[PDB]
Structures are given as C-alpha cells and as structure tokens.
Amino acid sequence: MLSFQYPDVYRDETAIQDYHGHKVCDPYAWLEDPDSEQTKAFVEAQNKITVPFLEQCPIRGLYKERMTELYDYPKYSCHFKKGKRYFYFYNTGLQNQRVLYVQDSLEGEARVFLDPNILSDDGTVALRGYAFSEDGEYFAYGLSASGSDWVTIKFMKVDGAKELPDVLERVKFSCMAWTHDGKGMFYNAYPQQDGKSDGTETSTNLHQKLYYHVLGTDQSEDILCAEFPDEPKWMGGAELSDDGRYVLLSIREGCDPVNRLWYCDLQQESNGITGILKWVKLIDNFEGEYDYVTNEGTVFTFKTNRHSPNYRLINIDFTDPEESKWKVLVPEHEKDVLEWVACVRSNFLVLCYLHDVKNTLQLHDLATGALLKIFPLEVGSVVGYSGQKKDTEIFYQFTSFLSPGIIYHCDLTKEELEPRVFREVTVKGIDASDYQTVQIFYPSKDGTKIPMFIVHKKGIKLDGSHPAFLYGYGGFNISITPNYSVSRLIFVRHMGGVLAVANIRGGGEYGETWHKGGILANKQNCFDDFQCAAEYLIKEGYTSPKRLTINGGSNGGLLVATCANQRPDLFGCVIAQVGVMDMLKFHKYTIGHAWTTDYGCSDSKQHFEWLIKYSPLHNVKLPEADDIQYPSMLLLTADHDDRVVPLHSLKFIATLQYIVGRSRKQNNPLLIHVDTKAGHGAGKPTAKVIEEVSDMFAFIARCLNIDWIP
Ligand SMILES: O=C([C@@H]1C[C@H](n2cc(-c3ccc(F)cc3)nn2)CN1C(=O)CCCc1ccccc1)N1CCCC1
Numbered sequence: 001m002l003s004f005q006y007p008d009v010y011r012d013e014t015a016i017q018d019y020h021g022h023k024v025c026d027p028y029a030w031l032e033d034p035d036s037e038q039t040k041a042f043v044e045a046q047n048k049i050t051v052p053f054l055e056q057c058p059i060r061g062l063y064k065e066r067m068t069e070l071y072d073y074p075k076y077s078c079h080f081k082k083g084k085r086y087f088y089f090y091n092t093g094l095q096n097q098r099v100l101y102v103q104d105s106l107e108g109e110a111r112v113f114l115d116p117n118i119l120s121d122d123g124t125v126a127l128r129g130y131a132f133s134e135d136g137e138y139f140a141y142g143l144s145a146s147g148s149d150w151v152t153i154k155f156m157k158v159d160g161a162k163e164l165p166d167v168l169e170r171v172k173f174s175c176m177a178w179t180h181d182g183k184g185m186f187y188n189a190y191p192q193q194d195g196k197s198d199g200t201e202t203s204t205n206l207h208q209k210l211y212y213h214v215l216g217t218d219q220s221e222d223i224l225c226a227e228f229p230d231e232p233k234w235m236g237g238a239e240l241s242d243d244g245r246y247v248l249l250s251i252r253e254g255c256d257p258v259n260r261l262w263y264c265d266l267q268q269e270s271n272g273i274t275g276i277l278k279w280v281k282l283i284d285n286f287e288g289e290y291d292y293v294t295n296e297g298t299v300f301t302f303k304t305n306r307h308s309p310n311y312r313l314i315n316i317d318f319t320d321p322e323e324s325k326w327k328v329l330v331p332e333h334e335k336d337v338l339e340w341v342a343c344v345r346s347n348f349l350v351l352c353y354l355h356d357v358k359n360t361l362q363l364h365d366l367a368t369g370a371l372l373k374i375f376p377l378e379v380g381s382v383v384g385y386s387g388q389k390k391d392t393e394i395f396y397q398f399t400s401f402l403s404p405g406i407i408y409h410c411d412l413t414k415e416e417l418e419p420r421v422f423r424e425v426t427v428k429g430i431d432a433s434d435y436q437t438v439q440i441f442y443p444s445k446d447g448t449k450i451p452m453f454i455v456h457k458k459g460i461k462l463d464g465s466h467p468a469f470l471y472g473y474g475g476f477n478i479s480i481t482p483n484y485s486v487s488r489l490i491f492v493r494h495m496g497g498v499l500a501v502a503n504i505r506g507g508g509e510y511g512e513t514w515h516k517g518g519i520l521a522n523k524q525n526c527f528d529d530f531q532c533a534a535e536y537l538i539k540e541g542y543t544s545p546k547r548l549t550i551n552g553g554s555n556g557g558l559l560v561a562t563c564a565n566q567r568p569d570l571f572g573c574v575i576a577q578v579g580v581m582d583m584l585k586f587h588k589y590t591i592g593h594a595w596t597t598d599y600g601c602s603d604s605k606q607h608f609e610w611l612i613k614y615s616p617l618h619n620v621k622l623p624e625a626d627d628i629q630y631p632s633m634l635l636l637t638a639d640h641d642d643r644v645v646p647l648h649s650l651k652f653i654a655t656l657q658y659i660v661g662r663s664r665k666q667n668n669p670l671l672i673h674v675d676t677k678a679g680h681g682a683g684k685p686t687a688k689v690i691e692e693v694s695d696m697f698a699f700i701a702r703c704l705n706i707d708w709i710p
Contacts, residue, residue, distance in 0.1 A: 001667060001669070001702075001703075002667060002669060004049040004052070004053065005049075006049070006657040006661050006662075006670075007042065007045035007046060007048075007049070007657075009028070009042060009654045009657070009658065010030070010038070011027035011028070011658070012026075012027050012028070012029060012030055013025070013027055015027055015029045015030075019584065019602055019608050019612075020605040020608055022608065022612065024584065024612075024618070026651075028650070028651040028654040028655065029651075031647050031650040031651050031654065032202065032585075032647045032651075034200050034201070034202065034639070034645075034646070034647070035200070039650070042650065042654070043639070043650070043674045046653065046671070046672045046673075046674065047672075047673060047674060049671065050634075050671040050672060050673045051673070053669060053671060053699075053702070054673070054695050054698050054699060054702075055698075056702070057698065057701065057702050059697075059698055059701040059702070059706075059708055060694050060695075060697075060698035060701075062494075062708050063490060063494070063693075063694050063697045063698060063701070063708075064690060064691075064694040066429075066490050066494060067486065067487060067490060067690050067693055067694060068094070068690060069429060070427055070429045070430060070486045070489070070490065071093070071094065071486045071487075071686075071690065072093035072094050073093055073404060073425050073426075073427050074090070074091070074092060074093055074425050075090070075091040075093070075098065075404075075425075076088060076089065076090050076397075076407060076423050076425075077089035077090070077098070077384055077397070078384045078385060078386045078395035078396065078397050078407055079106070079386065079395050079407075079409075079422070080386035080395065081136075081386075081391055081393075082132040082136035082158075083132070083135050083136020083137055083158070084104070084136060085102050085103065085104055085136060085158065086102070086103050086104075086105070086106060086108075087100060087101065087102050087103075087113065088100075088101055088110075089101070091686075094686055095117055095123075095686060096117055096122070096123020096685035096686045096687055097115075097116040097117050097123055097126055097127070097683075097685060097686075098116075099112060099114070099115045099116070099117065100112075100113045100114040100115075100127075101113055102158070102161075113158075113161055114127070114139075114141065114156070114161070116143075119143070120145075122677065122685065122687070123685025123686065123687060123688075124145065124146050124147065124677045124678070124685060124688075125143055125144070125145050126143070126144050126147075126682075126683030126684075126685075127141055127142065127143065127683070128142040128143065128144040128149075128151050128682065128683060129141070129142035129151060129153075129174065129176055130142065130176065131176035131177060131178060131185065132158075132178070133178045133182050133185075134178055134180040134182065134240075134244065135182060136158060137157065137158050137159065137182070138155065138156070138157055138158060138178070138182065138215065139155065139156045139157075139158055140153055140154070140155050140176055140178070140185055140187075141153065141154055141155075141156070142154075142171065142174070142176070144679075144682075144683055145198070145199075145640075146198070146199055146640040146676075146677040146678060146679060147199065147638060147640045147641065147677070147678040147679025147680065147681070147682070147683055147684060148198060148199025148640045148642050148679050149172050149173065149199065149590075149591070149642050149643055149679070149680070150170075150171070150172055150197055150198065150199060150642070151171040151172060151174060152167060152168065152169055152171065153166075153167070153168035153171050153174075153176070153187060154166070154167055155167075155215065164215070164216075166213065166215060166216070166217075166219075167219065168187060168189070168213060168219050168222075169189075169219065170189040170190050170191075170192070170197070171187055171188065171189050172188070172189075172190055172205060172208075173188065173205075173208065173235060173591065174187050174188035174189070174237075175187060175188055175210075175237035175238050175239065177238045177239045177240050177247075178240070179212075179240060179244070179247075179266070179273070180240060180243075180244025181244070182215075183214055183215065183272075183273075184212050184213050184214040184215055184273070185212070185213050185215070186210060186211070186212050186213075186225065186238040186247070187210075187211055187213060188208050188209065188210055188211070188235065188236070188237065189208070189209060189211055190205055190206075190207065190208055190209075191207050191209070198640070199640035199641075199642040199679055200639060200640055200642075201590075201642070202588075202589040202590060202642075202645045202647065203589075203590070204588065204589060204590060204592075204593060205590055205591050205593075206232040206233065206593075207227075207228075207229070207232050208234070208235045208236070209224060209226065209227045209236075210224070210225045210226040210227070210236045210237075210238055210249070211223065211224055211225060212225050212273050223273055223274060223275060224275065224276065225238075225247075225273065225275075225276060225277050226238075226249060226276065226277065226279065227276075228251075231253070233253045233254070233593055233594070234251050234252070234253050235251065235252045235253070236249050236250070236251045237249070237250050237251075237252070238250075239292060241292070241294075241295050241300075242294050242295065242343070242388070242389040242390070243295065244266075245265060245266060245267060246263050246264065246265055246266065246295070247263065247264040247266060247277065248261065248262075248263050248292050249261070249262040249263065249264070249279065250290070250291075250292075253286060253594075254593075254594050254595070254596060254597035255476055255594050255595055255597045255598060256286070256477075256597040256598075257289045257305060257477050257512065257515075258286045258287060258288055258289050258305075259283075259286070259289055259290060260281070260283055260284055260285065260286060261282050261283040261290040261302075262279040262280060262281050262282060262283075262284070263279070263280050263282055263318070264277040264278055264279055264280070265278075265280070280318075282316070282318065282321060287306065288304055288305055288306030288307075289303070289304055289305045289306070290302040290303075290304055290306075290316075291303040291304070291340075291341075293313065293341045293342070293343055293349065294343035294349075294366070294389055296366075298317050298318040298319045299315050299316075299317050299318075300315065300316050300317075300318065301313060301314070301315050301329060301343070301349075301366070302314055302315075302316060303338060303340070303341050305511075305512050308332040309332075309511040309512035309513045310332050310333050310334070310335065310336060310337045310338065310510075310511040310512075311332065311337055311338035311339075311511065312328060312330060312331055312332040312338060313328075313329040313330035313338070313341060313349070313351075313369065314326045314327065314328055314329060315327040315329050329368075329369040330349075330351065330364065330369040333353070335355075335510070336353045336354060336355045336360075337353065337354040337479070337508065337509070337510065337511045338351060338352075338353055339352045339353060339354050339359070339479070340352050340385075342385060342387055342388070342394075343366065343388070343389045344387035344388060344389060344391055344392075344393075344394055344412060345387075345389075345391065345392045345393075345412040345413070346366075346389060346390075347365065347366040347367065348363055348364070348365070348366060348372070348412060349363070349364040349365070349366055349369075350362070350363060350364075350385070350387060350394060351363075351364055352382050352385075354479055354481065354508075354509065356439065356451060357439070357451050357453070357479065357480075357481055357482075357503050357509050358377075358379050358380065358381075358481070358482070359377060359380065359381050359382045359398075359481065360374070360377065361374075361375040361377060361382055361396065362374055362375070363375065363412075363417070373417050375396070375408070375410070375419050376419075377398055378398070378400060379400060379437065379482065380398055380399055380400030380401070380403075380405070380481075380482040381398065381399050381400070381481040381482050381483060382396055382397065382398055383397050383398070383399050383405075383483070384396065384397035384407075385397070387412075392411070392412055392413045393409060393410060393411045393412055393413075394409070394410050394412065395407055395408065395409050395422060396408050399482070399483055399484045400437070400482045400483075400484065401435075401437050401453070401455050401482045401483070401484065401485075401499070402430075402432040402435055402437065402455070402484075402489075403426075403432055403484060404425050404426070404427055404484045405424075405484060406421055406422075406423070406424045407421075407422045407423040407424070408420065408421060408422055409422035427486065430486070430489050430493060434457060434458060434493075435455060435456065435457055435458060435489075435492065436455070436456065436458050437453055437454070437455050437482070438453070438454050439451060439452070439453050439454075440452050440454065440536070442532060442533065442536040443532070444505075444525070444528055444529045444532045445528045445532060446525070446528070448505070448517075448525075448529075450502060450503060450504055450505070450529050450532065450533065451502075451503040451509065452500055452501065452502045452503065452533055452536065453482065453499075453500065453501045453503075454498060454499070454500045454537075454542065455488075455492065455498070455499040455500075456492065456497075456498045456499070456542070457492065457493075457496075460498075461541075462540060462541030462542060463541055464538070464541050464542070464543060464544040464547075465544070465547075466496060466497060466498045466542060466543055466547065467491075467495060467496060467497045467498070467543065467547045467548075467549070467700070467704055467706055468497060468498040468499075468500060468537055468542055468543035468547060468548050468549065469488065469491055469497055469498070469499050469500070469549050469551060469700070470500045470501075470502065470530075470533060470534055470537065470548060470549070470550045470551070471499075471500065471501045471502070471550075471551050471552065471556070472501070472502045472504050472526075472529075472530045472533070472550075472552050472556055472559050472560075473504075473506075473507060473552060473553075473554070473555055473556040473559065474504040474505060474506035474507055474518050474526035474529065474530065474552075474555065474556065474559050475506040475507070475518060475519065475526065475555040475556075475558075475559075475598050476506070476515075476555060476598055477507070477508035477512070477515040478507055478508055478555075479503070479507050479508040479509045480501055480503055480507060480509070482501075487693035487696075487697070490697070491697060491700075493709070494708055494709050494710070495697065495700070495701065495706050495708065495709065496706070496709055498537070498542045498543060500533065500537055500542070502529065502530055502533035504518065504525075504526050504529035504530050504533070504559075505517035505518035505522070505525045505526055505529055506518020506519055506523070506525070506526045506555075506598070519597070519598045519599070520598070520599070520600050520607075520610065521600075521610055523598075523599065523610060523614060524613070524614060526559060527559065527562050527563055527566060527614060530550070530559055530560075530563055531563060531566065531567050531570060534548060534550065534563075534567075534570050534571065535570070538570075545569060545570050545571060545572060546572045546704070547572055547704060548570070548571050548572050548573070549571070549572060549573035549574070549575065549700050549704070550563060550571050550573075550574050550575075551574075551575045551576075551577070551696070552576060552577070552579070553576075553577035553578050553579070553681065554577070554578050554579065554580070554643070554644060554680065554681075555580065555598070556576075556577070556579070557576035557577050557578055557579020557580065557581075557635075557644075558576075558579050558580045558581065558583075558616065560574050560575070560576045560579070561574070561576045561579050561581055561616035561635075561652065562614045562615075562616050562619070564576075564616075564630060564631055564633060565614075565616060565619040565620060565621065566614075566619070568623050568628055568629065568630045568631055569623070569625075569628050571631040572631055572632065572703065572704050573631055573632045573633075573634075573699070573700050573703050573704060574631045574632070574633045574634070575633075575634045575636065575696050575699065575700075576633070576634075576635050576636070576649075577635075577636045577637075577681075578636065578637055578638075578641055578643070578644045578649075578680055578681065579616070579635065579637075579644065579648060579649060579652075580592075580595070580644055580648055581615075581616040581617050581648040581649060581651065581652035582615065582616075582617045582647070582648050582651060582652075583599060583602070583611040583612075583614070583615035583616070583617070583618070584602040584608070584611060584612070584615060584617075584618065585602070586599070586648070587601050587602070587603075589645040589647070590642050590643065590645060591643065592644075592645075599611065616652055617648075617651055617652050617655060620652075620655045620656055620659045620660060621659070622659065622660060622663055626665065629660075629663075629665050629666045629667065629668055630656070630660045630666060630668060630670065631668060632668040632669055632670075632699070632703035632704075633656065633668070633669070633670045633671070634669075634671050634672070634673070634695075634696070634699045635649040635652065635653055635671070635672040635673070636649075636672075636673055636675070636692065636695070636696075637649040637650075637672070637673075637674055637675070638674060638675040638676070638677075638678035638679055638680075639674055639675070639676055639677075639678070640677065640678060640679040641678070641679045641680045642679060642680070643679065643680035644680060646674060649672055649674075650672070650674075653670065653671070653672040656670040657670055668703065669703065671699075673695060675688065675692075
C-alpha cells in the first residue's frame, strides 16, 4: 500500500526545555515559524506524498461526483426583518458562499443585497459578522480573507445597497453594535503589531479594546470607550439594550461561560460618546454568565448559570442590584439545559431547551415566566432563529441527521398561535425512510452514562461487518446535536457505513457539570468516554476495530489524536482536522491563551502534570505488542488557520513519521494535508468543502479497502 517515502525532516536535538524539573525535547520546534524556507519546504514535501495517495483510487472521484450532486440543494437561512424590509441568506446549491437577499415584504420580489461570491475568484472572501442599524437603514459587515479570524468591517446604506467609504481594520473577535441614534457603531480592535496580520502569523492577541466609530469619519477618529491595560487577556464586547438606553459590556477572559457585566446609561454621558464611558460595574467578577435577554426600564432579564449549571432566567433591577434581591423568572430545570432565550413581540420569551441532546422550543410570558405554548419539533436541532423585541413574528430553522430541515414561521399577533412550514427542501438521492437514528446511553470507565446517536440503514445485522465513522468533540461547553450532513450520508449509503456521534464530557449536553467533567484535571474523562464509545460499537456488533474510523476537529482533533496514542488497537483510521496537538505550547500563539480555562496551562506545575499525560505531541510511542501498529492517520490543516496555528499538526506529523512511520511493523500511512487560502473552517467555500470531504472519505476507503456501493 505504501509506495512513497516519508520526507527527511531535521531534528534539532538541542531543543530542550525544563518544565518544573521535567525535561522536554522539542526537535521540531523550528516548524513553529510558518515563514521559514525550512517550514515551507516541509509543507511542500508532505503535500507531495499525501495528494497522490488521496487522488490515486477511483473512489475519490465517485465520492466527489456524488457529493456534488447530493449537496446541490437550496439552502436558506431564516427570514429576519430589519426596519421596513426583510432579509435572508440563500445558496442556490453550489455557490461558494451564501448570498444575502432583501425584499420589501414577505410577498415581495427579492433582490441581491450582498453577494460575497463576487469578491474573489475562488470564494475565499467570506462574511464574518454583521449588524444593521436599529432603523434598518444602514448595514455594517465583516469580511475575512482566506479563512482567517481577522476582519475588515465595511458599511452600506440599505436603500439602493450603496457602498459607503467607512472601513475598519485590525478587527478580530469583535462585537458590532450600533447606537440607536444611528450615529455610529461599537466594535473591537487590537493594537498594531510587528509582522503580518493576515492569518499566517502566530503572534499572540492581547490588549483588545472597545472603540466607537462615527459613520462618515476615518477610523483614526474613533473613540476609545473601554480598555484593560492591566489585564491583557480581557475582551469587552458591547451591545445596546433593546430600548437603546444602555450599553452593556460583557467582559470575557478565556472560554468559560462567565463574564463581567458593566453598563453605561447613555443618557448620563456628559456630552454623548466622547471617551471612556461612565461604566457602572454591576457584576465585577468572572463567577457566572449573564447573557442579556431584554429589559423593561431598570429591570434586566438575563440568562445565567450563576449557581444554576443547567441555566435559568433572572431579573436584576439596576436600582436594587444586590444578589439577594434578584428575581428568578424562569427557574433552572433539574436536567434540561436552557440553551438560549430571545424576547419577541414586546412581552414574549422564546426558550430553547436541550433535552437528552435534542432541542425543544417554548413560548413564555415575560412578566411571569409562565409557559404559554410549545412549538412541536421532531428529534433534532434548532439551528437558526429570528424574532426581536419590536418584531411580531418568529422564524426558526430545524435540522436532523436525515433531513436538511424546515424553516417554520409563526405570526405572534394572532390570538391562536400556529407555527407553519415556511420553507422545506428535500434531497433526492437520499430516502430518509431507508435509515434510522437511535440514541443509546453507554457506561464510561467510571460508570457515567454517556449519550450516543447512531445512524444506520434499517435492518442491518449487528455482526461487526460494517465500517463505522465515530465523531466527537468534548469541550468548551459545546453540545453536539443532530445536524444534516450529506457527506456523512454518502458514507452510509454508498460506503455501507454506520454513523455515530458520542456526547462525551467536556460538552454542554448536561450543562456546566457536563462541561466541568471534561476539563482541567478531568480532561482524560473525554478520552475515556470516547474510547468507551468505540468499545460499545464493537461489542454491540455495529463495527470492528479494523473497520472503525474516528474523526474530530479543533478540540475534537485533540480528542482523536490522543485516542490514537492511547488505544491504537481500537481504530482502523483516524482523521484529525485542525487539532490542538502541542498541549505544552498552545497558549503561546494567537488566541490560544483563551483555552486555558478548558485545558490549564503548562506554566503551572500542577497543570503540566495533567497535560503531559495526554498531549498528542508528547505521547507518540510505538505500541509494545508486535501485532499492534498505529491506525492510518490523516491530519488536515490550512496555512491561514490562525485559530489553531498549523504548527500543531506540522510538529505532530513529523513526530508520528519519525517515531512510528520508521518502524518496520508500521504499514498504515501517517499523512498530513495543508490547504492554501483556508483557515480553521468558518467561511470555507463550498468548493473547498467538497474537496475536503472527498479527501476524508477517499482516505477511509483506501486504508480500509471499502468498495463503493452505487
Ligand atoms: O476555537 C476554539 C474555541 C472554541 C469556542 N467555541 C466555538 C463554538 C461554536 C459552537 C457552535 C458552532 F456552530 C460554531 C462554533 N462554541 N465555542 C470558541 N473558541 C475560541 O477560541 C474563541 C476565540 C475568541 C474568544 C476568546 C475568549 C472569549 C470570547 C471569544 N478552540 C480552538 C481550539 C480549541 C478551542
């Protein structure tokens, strides 16, 4: 199978660092410089072996053709009203980027408002954030190039879709919030830095500030409204209250669901927005999350997890703000997580719950919190919503494993509410009735019951004969809920596969306690949970180790890379996308400092002792048993991934190829592909998505010798 040779890769045997008495050698530390001739030559040499391996077997073309056919279906966002007009996103099927449309009424002719496709030949300029002015007449939007997190903000007048001159640079991880007087907009920027700011650099991002841009002026005149010079990791995002009276500042440090909450009563400014605002430090610690829902005068409704790990709604009166005075509007549920809340039609709340990893949607009274109406849903996810306080209708978008889903609409001015199907598309080529989704709960090592969804063809025999594709993430309070993937359904239909998604700890599926169960000292629970999911699929006869592929991206790429090191005997194939691999150095680059809330940081002796045990870069070891080799492994990254800098995957593949690839018993390939004009994944054009999934499934097919089923 292996008709190539791994590239020679220099080992700097002098690269030795002491961590609290523990010496660590890092012979590929030089791969941390993305700009060097050495690193560029490494990337070229690696792509030179991977690409022919992926493209060789005809199965890639079969998969690509079917993906192109089946992914070509119309894709809509919810409609949403801003001022006098409605907007929605739409992709006719295979456009690289979805297009923003406008119409003057629901029954009215729609026209193109913003088409990002015309901004690049290859679809690599994408929308990243936007905000309409409160009256709907002006529009700010972020553009990112080549998949970087960096944003340039541009502006348009809505009537006539007129480009304006205003341009804001150095924007990253930014809010966008217009004052209701229509004068200007809050946003965040970083100070100037040496070197590049295009997504290929690794430079740490510190000292983010909050600015106010007056429409019709140069960025150099923007007002500095908040800064944290003694706290370089703090990030302050602004939003206006629904009545326009208050700027609410949510300060974050790290990725935990907590924030400080400061407010500025704009009417109390001495002369409008002229400098640092008169912040009132309502919640001046990082002990809980406070997510603004709405206010009525001084009574502010927040979604919180303060002593409520499944979340709840509280009212804080700014005139009586002591915690013992807060009113619990909607108490916490014993098991169900309150995922998000919106206020609509003045005095309604829309609450979206997660119940055993499936969404529900409810309408409640704002004054009392009482339940008024259940909006019924099939088993799946709510993935889009519109309906703000001044609006009188909601749209929401549902999706599931087997259907691209439905957009529903409900006119909330009606005495008797009845949600109605607004848009529904069906994918022909996949008959949903041929498949089933089951949810099971399996015990992990410590006995905890973990949910898992399994999707498969109805009537299969559980005789261990089927290829399986097992996905997980496990971190950052992210809940992995049902979603429609044509790419995975092609694996089911045309490769005879079984799909599985394990809701391992670290996620948000059972609230903040589920999250804390997969972080810091307990990060190993994630790996244990995921290995136990694989053991479940094997014991129950869905699959066998030689037929099992695991996949994860980002924090999920860490997941699958560590699982390869810890249990190589369990997996046939591992695909780690954009993964965090160097757990000792991740905090040094770009925004990696923010992840210390899930992982810890190697600067601490205690944290180092957790991290060293599972860090993928530091645990590559030949399996002791003669009959055990590493699984086939493919790492996917891209040269503008400034979220997880690609040195993680570069150093990891160098280590895999040297320690394991050189061994006589290793015949499974250990490969990387580094894409160009792409980053962590947000905004990736359709063309690149199709190539990526074709690479993934070709790798699986070749390594596991799976025949195509037409
Ligand atoms: O990018 C990240 C983390 C994960 C975190 N995240 C993503 C999602 C998500 C969920 C659903 C979905 F469809 C798409 C994305 N939810 N949380 C945002 N993150 C960051 O690093 C965010 C960086 C910016 C930041 C930092 C601190 C405070 C605020 C903002 N990581 C990369 C390596 C592992 C963590």
